[PDB]
Amino acid sequence: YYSTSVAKLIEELSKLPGIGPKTAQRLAFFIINMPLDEVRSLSQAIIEAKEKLRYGKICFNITDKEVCDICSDENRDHSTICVVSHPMDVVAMEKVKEYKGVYHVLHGVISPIEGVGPEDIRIKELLERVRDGSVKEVILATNPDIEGEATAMYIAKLLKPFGVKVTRIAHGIPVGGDLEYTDVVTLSKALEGRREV
Amino acid sequence: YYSTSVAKLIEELSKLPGIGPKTAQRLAFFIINMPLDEVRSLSQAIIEAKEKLRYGKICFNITDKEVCDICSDENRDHSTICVVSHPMDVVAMEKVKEYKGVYHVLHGVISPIEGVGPEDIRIKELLERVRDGSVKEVILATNPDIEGEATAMYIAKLLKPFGVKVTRIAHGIPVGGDLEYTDVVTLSKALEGRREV
Ligand SMILES: [Zn+2]
Ligand SMILES: [Zn+2]
Structure with missing residues (x-):
């Protein structure tokens, strides 16, 4: 005990x-x-990861370079920024192997129920990336939680002042799902935002 | 035993x-x-259910009469016809409690593998309904399945000869879902369907 x-x-x-x-x-x-080593390995790791934690220069991502392999590369359009929340989102997103733009991780979301609000999330610095208005479109792709929506609902308040396109991720029926098992809220969105074939 | x-x-x-x-x-x-009486009521319902079952002459939904309790009612919007694959779908869509139109049940999806072609599902009655009726909107609400997709894209060629708005149900991120576990084909559409504001 x-x-x-x-x-x-x-x-x-x-x-x-x-x-x-x-x-x-x-x-x-x-x-x-x-065995002792293992604990020292474990321990070191917990502290080496923190002592070498690299934040991207442009996109605040957590790659091992000062500038992320995504933001480097000259084929990536530094003018569409795809907002997200987590280093992990960024990997998700790049798996769709279709994105052209660059990202902006915020490193969380705005839940006054976990210990957070605007400050602790990289919003301040996002605005500065477009302060000059040399971005055509922001794409705010957080989650469609009350998590995501808070943050998005109003990051897009703040991007109002600038001359930008503030597009949000699309909400509806997942592919491979069917209408018989889909939530009543998922369904009404799916329905009232119908993409005119 | x-x-x-x-x-x-x-x-x-x-x-x-x-x-x-x-x-x-x-x-x-x-x-x-x-009790016997209750045991007889299932037995009874089970049987009178199947016996009494019939399909409406307009939307081909499952009803008890000649015309769906929906089409028989004349203050719903007969302009917009919500194609949909099965009778249970119409139940889904109706619990969403926003759609004001009327349905058309197809009873299946074009499925080269099942042997079902286009003349094996109520697709023609739809043309007729839309060739002869005064139709504003022909929402396609089949499933996002591979088979369910082909269908909605078949029907939609058929409906361009006519002078009508053929919309499709929005494919995206299921509300209150997460980006990490949403799969790529859903994502690539979530993102590609992105919508301003
Ligand atoms: Zn970067
Ligand atoms: Zn009917």
Whole structure:
């Protein structure tokens, strides 16, 4: 029943997210049983990743270059910016192997329920990328959560002042889904925004 | 191992989808413990259901009369016809509680593999409905499936000879979904369908 140096590893493991008490408890032990090196590997990593954390110059992404392989390359149109939230979104998006523009990660979303609001999210710096208006279109592709929508709903308030196209990601019926199992809200959007064949 | 009257029920039930042998067993005993009269009411509904079933002469939906309780009602908008694949779809779409038009059931999708061609689903009646009626809008609400796509794109060539607005249900991100787990073909459309503001 959890001696010190352990009632903290736990205490601090169970602050990581998707890590319940259960888990911080279970997980902590496996750890004390790993061979020393392994723990030092683990530990170093947790701290090396942080000591070398590279933020993109243009797009605030987390590549290992000062300027991301996406923002470098001269085929990518630095004039359509695709807003997102997470380094991970960016990989998702590039898998559609169709995007031409460049990204702007914000590193989260605006949920006054997790510990956040405009400041902690790279919005301030997004505006400055278009302050000169040498971007034709922003594409705000966060999630269609109340997460995503907050942020988007009004990032697009702020991009009003500038001479830009502020397009939002399309909402509707996923492909390979069918109408019989689709939510009533997904459905009404799908319906009231019908893409005139 | 159970009685023989009961084997049968079990079995018979187990052929209905969504009920496996644990459940085909459970309901078998529940059913046969309720009063005779209730037990007779299922038995009854089950039978009068199938017997009484008919399709409307206009939209080919499943109804009880000659004309869908929808088309029989004359203050819905007979201008806009919401093509849709199956009778259960119309139920979906109707629970959305916004569409004011009328349907046309096709009863299937052009499916070279099933053997079903275009003259095997109520597609012609649709032309007739639209050639002879005064039709403003012919919404296509088939599924985003491969087969369901082909269909809506077949019907839509047919309808350009005529002078009508052929719209399609919007394909995109299912509301309250996430970018990380949405698949690429949905994404590439979410993004390609992007809409201003
Ligand atoms: Zn970059
Ligand atoms: Zn009808």
